[PDB]
Design a binder for this molecule. Structure first.
Ligand SMILES: O=P(O)(O)OC[C@H]1O[C@](O)(CO)[C@@H](O)[C@@H]1O
Ligand SMILES: O=P(O)(O)OC[C@H]1O[C@](O)(CO)[C@@H](O)[C@@H]1O
Lengths: 555, 555
């Protein structure tokens, strides 16, 4: 494994074993009035500012310099160029990795197999916009002449999470668009509950699937089509209510979808990096194409920042190395994402796939098994709610949990003259402050006494009211959560994930870890039919199956 | 500082560092045809069966024997009795812990300092039912005479999560109840977007708050009240549109809500254990009281199972110790909860509070600092959805992640003649099998050769196709997800949490870790006012506040 052999990494490791343990945030802040200044970065996008404050982290100039040396010696910069230049860095699949090309507004050429990719990219974007305009304008009618009122996206992986998260995040910008629904789970209640609120005459289904062979999506699509034709009665009417987003023309046609109703993307577009491609059709339909182009632009802006900025002032690089520090030196298993924005309620879930499916690996690009930790477990819920659910464990638990706090300065809903947002911001600020500062035995004791506690209560409560603090957090504050800023925020993390993948020398763009489950599932499906017990598996799988056959009857 | 010195704990520890890394699930099943039989328990509740299959765990009779010795060695049973008996086991607050009283269907007496609590418990249940009856029948009219069509629950944390999770999970049983909304975040966006869809004339607001002073809920409540009073203007109309669930009568009255409109509970009802009390009013309104009683009965059934079952056959006890095993011996930081049911999409979020806010502690009951791990980080998403998001990391990542897979045998929507559910069950089964069995290099190699891949391509890809397996999981299968069954499942985990807290000797029923953030938030709140720079905090908090003030009016 490259990482553990790297001299910059080893130097980092020994420093941690002989210093890291004594690092204390409160102390660091008390002895360096320039800490915020030295450990924060402000980005002016001309469309809002983004403040990345990483000063509340367990680091020093020395640690940062070492972390940055490591990034450099692991070839982060060269790796980045190869990605942008269209090289097939996805080594196990021999594929290019060009999600940056999907939002390359500069249209600077990017050649893969001797051919520039942009023309195809823009071609689909035009197709998307033209189609979106017709549906939005009402020009596009159903099989009964009615205009489309509901758009239903049926997809699962990177074919669901992104479009769902962004549409939720940008609701304030969906003024003139139809209602968008998202169906993904094979679980029947999902599609059933949806179709129950729809009129086939005014419903448009979007079959989103890179491969167009995923069982859940195809089954859901077929179910939606059956339900539809039950009323439309003429297979020819399908061309007015079903479109597909995929890279597989054959499967699409085989499904029965008109080829002009196919918005394609490419193999170098990873599912978990696809919302920027045709997969984002439901977004464009929801917020309009202008807002969608803003989304792409924001990501493009971030891509430029990542590409042209020296490492020491490079946002995604800084976040990545801060993560490496906690994962590989402090051994923290998780990474919490806590946005203080109800609209971003699906932000954390999106990066569970983005981050975990990318770096949840254990084999390097050379074929060697890692002998160090890789991708963390990403989780989180919107602020303040989380404060009333799990922060208890973050503040007084036994796990070190790196936290990323995000919040827009300006709210999309300044009700009560900004009272609500003022309180939201106060909590956002106070939480990272509290995690950092903590509360000593003495401070607690004085509070208890001042509060008028009796010698008994105080003595009883004292130890329980002590906060050891020293809990690291990142504070990412942006002027406003607009399509452009959101676009830049997502791209920022996409690049953080990329950097970490390079440091660990793993392929952040394949996902072989999903094959085993799929194949075993294919084996079990036919065995479930009938009441005959099964015994071709281990005793657990057999036992579970037999219980299912038995209880299938129970009334 | 109690568990680490327990004879059984140390014996358990020594065994692990001596054998722990030797355990291999695949080997354990390959050498014991009775494994499933010996490491699983079936529960017939008379209202459905629940199969807890814990055979795919890294354990043997010996390990389970030692784990159970630790359970009784730490006084789990005496502790259990104290809770049910009404003793003040919530030591730091000197309170009883009686959520089991809330659903005590047998009405056996349970006396707290003075009287038997059952009388007041049933008194509120009767009141809830009568009100619920009036609201659903249409008897209870809005201020202009219309029947109420929307019920808006306003609460946070324990006052929002249980209600939301249960109503989401029991959607199939609502037929007839008004639509229910849940407002919780202070973030203005939450109440703003909720109110924009309501008619003041037919909306009924439920202010859920145990203390009735939390800032988010009261603020949200005032905003709603103003909103309403903006179109009705008559303050006296409020009595037909606002009710309260709380233990604080004075504050409820001060808020402007009449007594008759207050559904109370008591201090021995922990917020994260309150959906069983008046807090469940929105659940009752949504699915009817018959179903609500069914929900309570299910919990009550599990309560009895927990109290009368020998430890080795006690479901919550087994789940608790397996957790202790992975937490304290394998050092696993997290617990994944993966229900293969879209209706349970909020189940994991619910227990993030129930578990994490309960056991995310570091001070024992004696006041000593723990020198071992406590509560884990709970997380998850409904399957198969997850299978396409983060399972990659669970299968080929670098972290051990204990996983609880849950699923109903019978679906609420058997569409397409059960095809969707069949596939859902197939994946449910195949995933734990895959996590267990893995796929060796030899197996992967055969596979690649059969695919006709040249030696070069084959060997470059081979290591990436290997699944080391040996990933432990629990499979919980129940006949159907009915109100009764959900209730038992929730109570089952409540008790798993109780047992673990007992073993760690922490107070699973207080939550002092949330106080610091609240104190600090009130401090900076007024400081946000004005354009003048703040310099009273650490440079980061100051820098963040000043960035906010600067961008507050940026265009
Ligand atoms: O869009 P598709 O091709 O149907 O993929 C479903 C999802 O599952 C995966 O193939 C693996 O889980 C993803 O990478 C993808 O986003
Ligand atoms: O408004 P309430 O019902 O008093 O409670 C606030 C919620 O937040 C907490 O106080 C702490 O997170 C919970 O214990 C509780 O359920």
């Amino acid at each position: 494994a490259a990482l553990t052999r790297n001299p910059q990494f080893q130097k980092l490791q020994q420093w941690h074993r002989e210093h890291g343990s004594e690092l204390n945030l409160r102390h660091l802040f008390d002895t360096d009035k320039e800490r915020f200044n030295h450990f924060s970065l402000t980005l002016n996008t001309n469309h809002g500012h983004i403040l990345l404050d990483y000063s509340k982290n367990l680091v020093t100039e020395e640690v940062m310099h070492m972390l940055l040396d490591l990034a450099k010696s692991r070839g982060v910069e060269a790796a980045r160029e190869s990605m942008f230049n269209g090289e097939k860095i996805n080594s196990t699949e021999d594929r290019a990795v060009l999600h940056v090309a999907l939002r390359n507004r500069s249209n600077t050429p990017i050649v893969v197999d001797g051919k520039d990719v942009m023309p195809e990219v823009n071609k689909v974007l035009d197709k998307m916009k033209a189609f979106c305009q017709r549906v939005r304008s009402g020009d596009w009618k159903g099989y009964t002449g009615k205009t489309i009122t509901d758009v239903i996206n049926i997809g699962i992986g990177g074919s669901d999470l992104g479009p769902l998260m962004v549409t939720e995040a940008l609701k304030p910008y969906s003024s003139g668009g139809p209602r968008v629904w998202f169906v993904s789970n094979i679980d029947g209640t999902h599609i059933a509950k949806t179709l129950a609120c729809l009129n086939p005459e005014s419903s448009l289904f979007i079959i989103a699937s890179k491969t167009f062979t995923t069982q859940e999506t195809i089954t859901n699509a077929k179910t939606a089509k059956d339900w539809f034709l039950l009323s439309a009665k003429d297979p020819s009417t399908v061309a007015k209510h079903f479109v597909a987003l995929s890279t597989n023309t054959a499967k699409v046609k085989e499904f029965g979808i008109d080829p002009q109703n196919m918005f394609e993307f490419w193999d170098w577009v990873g599912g978990r990096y696809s919302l920027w491609s045709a997969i984002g059709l439901s977004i464009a339909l929801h917020v309009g194409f202008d807002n969608f182009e803003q989304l792409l632009s924001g990501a493009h802006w971030m891509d430029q920042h990542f590409r042209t900025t020296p490492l020491e002032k490079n946002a995604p690089v800084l976040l990545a190395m801060l993560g490496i520090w906690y994962i590989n030196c402090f051994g923290c298993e998780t990474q919490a994402v806590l946005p203080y924005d109800q609209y971003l309620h699906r932000f954390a879930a999106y990066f569970q796939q983005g981050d975990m499916e990318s770096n949840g690996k254990y084999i390097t690009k050379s074929g060697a098994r890692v002998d160090h930790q890789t991708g963390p477990i990403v989780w989180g819920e919107p602020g303040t709610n989380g404060q009333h659910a799990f922060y208890q464990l973050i503040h007084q638990g036994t796990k070190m949990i790196p936290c990323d706090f995000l919040i827009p300065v300006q709210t999309q809903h300044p009700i009560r003259k900004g009272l609500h947002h003022k309180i939201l911001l106060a909590n956002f600020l106070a939480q990272t402050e509290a995690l950092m500062k903590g509360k000593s035995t003495e401070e607690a004791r004085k509070e208890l006494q001042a509060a008028g506690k009796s010698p008994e209560d105080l003595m009883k409560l004292l130890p329980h009211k002590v906060f050891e603090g020293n809990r690291p957090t990142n504070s990412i504050v942006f002027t406003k959560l607009t399509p452009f800023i959101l676009g830049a925020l997502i791209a920022m993390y996409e690049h953080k994930i990329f950097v970490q993948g390079v440091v660990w020398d793993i392929n952040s763009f394949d996902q072989w870890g999903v094959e085993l489950g799929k194949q075993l599932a294919k084996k079990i499906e036919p065995e479930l039919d009938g009441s005959s017990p099964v015994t071709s598996h281990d005793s657990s799988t057999n036992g579970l199956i037999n219980f299912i056959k038995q209880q299938r009857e129970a009334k």
